[PDB]
Design an enzyme around this catalytic site. Structure first.
Site, PDB file in Angstrom:
ATOM      1  N   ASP A  35       0.827  -1.205   0.000  1.00  0.00           N
ATOM      2  CA  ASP A  35       0.000   0.000   0.000  1.00  0.00           C
ATOM      3  C   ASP A  35       0.863   1.257   0.000  1.00  0.00           C
ATOM      4  OD1 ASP A  35      -1.939   1.908   0.343  1.00  0.00           O
ATOM      5  OD2 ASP A  35      -2.439   1.358   2.426  1.00  0.00           O
ATOM      6  N   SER A 199      -0.687  15.470 -12.196  1.00  0.00           N
ATOM      7  CA  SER A 199      -0.957  15.093 -13.579  1.00  0.00           C
ATOM      8  C   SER A 199      -1.204  16.343 -14.420  1.00  0.00           C
ATOM      9  CB  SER A 199      -2.149  14.136 -13.654  1.00  0.00           C
ATOM     10  OG  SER A 199      -2.532  13.864 -14.995  1.00  0.00           O
TER      11      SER A 199
END
EC number: 3.4.23.22
Length: 330
Positions: A35, A199
């Site tokens: 994770d 992004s």
């Protein structure tokens, strides 16, 4: 040193991925959920409340000659989806794919929430975010990666998750045969303890690319792709019959649909998520309404590049003095 381990979907939908981890002496092998959105290595154990164990493999520290109780240490974690777990702490030898750390904090669960109990395939979590998020008190503990880093050939790990298929976590090297083209690296902020990056935009299907900054986290422990409501609405508008359902808890779509791809930007580069990766199947057994793999982050407070996005790429988690993230197509 290096390590290399195969990671395997837990079910036919890729709801999560498990990776075998050796703990203790002699080794006890548990299947952990790696994770990159948390920083605790915790396991089901001989100390876990009996009624809260249902099929998981447990760690028994009394059977490990290298286990030592970390005196006075406790832990307690709550995840973004409302799940939780807590307990006490041992140090022990932990190996992943041939890479060994001695003295790793292994957090033994005394209590786990129902969602953990109900998932018989996940024996615990191995956190790979920054150690500043580790919950051990009163002395915070280091992640497996943080402990291994100085010994690694290069201070990196890579995630190569499969679509409906096994994949690979590598530590200490970049497998140049595992991706196509080049790896594009992008800046990371560690201010919130995550692999947080921005992004450069998105496209839906064969549509034009929209240049827009989307701050989010690279999180192998989250199944879906969570993005701003505007972006998500633009995606599902291209699927006839798709709608946001408050009763179901997100966007659903007719199972008869053909889903468009979704592209996200990494600098000037582009990662394409095929439409099929966005199908999470019937909302309940036998239903013709299917759950979407792209969902709104509104009310999470952060955008999450979870497995739906990451499995479309070869992803480098670069733990150099100034961390960065790399993405390549594959």
């Amino acid at each position: 040193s290096t390590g290399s381990a195969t990671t395997t979907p837990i079910d036919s939908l890729d709801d999560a991925y498990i990776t075998p981890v050796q703990i203790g002496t002699p080794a006890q092998t548990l299947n952990l959920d790696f994770d990159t959105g948390s920083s605790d290595l915790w396991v089901f154990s001989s100390e876990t409340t009996a009624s809260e164990v249902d099929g998981q493999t447990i760690y028994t520290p009394s059977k490990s000659t290298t286990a030592k109780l970390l005196s006075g240490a406790t832990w307690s974690i709550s995840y973004g989806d409302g799940s939780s777990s807590s307990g006490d702490v041992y140090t022990d030898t932990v190996s992943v794919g041939g890479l060994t750390v001695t003295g790793q904090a292994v957090e033994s669960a005394k209590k786990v929430s129902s969602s953990f109990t109900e998932d018989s395939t996940i024996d615990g979590l191995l956190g790979l975010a920054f150690s500043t998020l580790n919950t051990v008190s009163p002395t915070q503990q280091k992640t497996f990666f943080d402990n291994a880093k100085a010994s690694l050939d290069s201070p990196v790990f890579t995630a190569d998750l499969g679509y409906h298929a096994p994949g690979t976590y590598n530590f200490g090297f970049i497998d140049t045969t595992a991706y196509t083209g080049s790896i594009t690296y992008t800046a990371v902020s560690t201010k919130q303890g995550f692999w947080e990056w921005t992004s450069t935009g998105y496209a839906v299907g064969s549509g034009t690319f929209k240049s827009t900054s989307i701050d989010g986290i690279a999180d192998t422990g989250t199944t879906l792709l969570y993005l701003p409501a505007t972006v998500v609405s633009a995606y599902w508008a291209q699927v006839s019959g798709a709608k946001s359902s408050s009763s179901v808890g997100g966007y659903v779509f007719p199972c008869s649909a053909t889903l468009p791809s979704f592209t996200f930007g990494v600098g000037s580069a582009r990662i394409v998520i095929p439409g099929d990766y966005i199908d999470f199947g019937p909302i309940s057994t036998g239903s013709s309404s299917c759950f979407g793999g792209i969902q709104s982050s509104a009310g999470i407070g952060i955008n999450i590049f979870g497995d739906v996005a990451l499995k479309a790429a070869f992803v480098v988690f670069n733990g150099a003095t100034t961390p960065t993230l790399g993405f390549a197509s594959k």
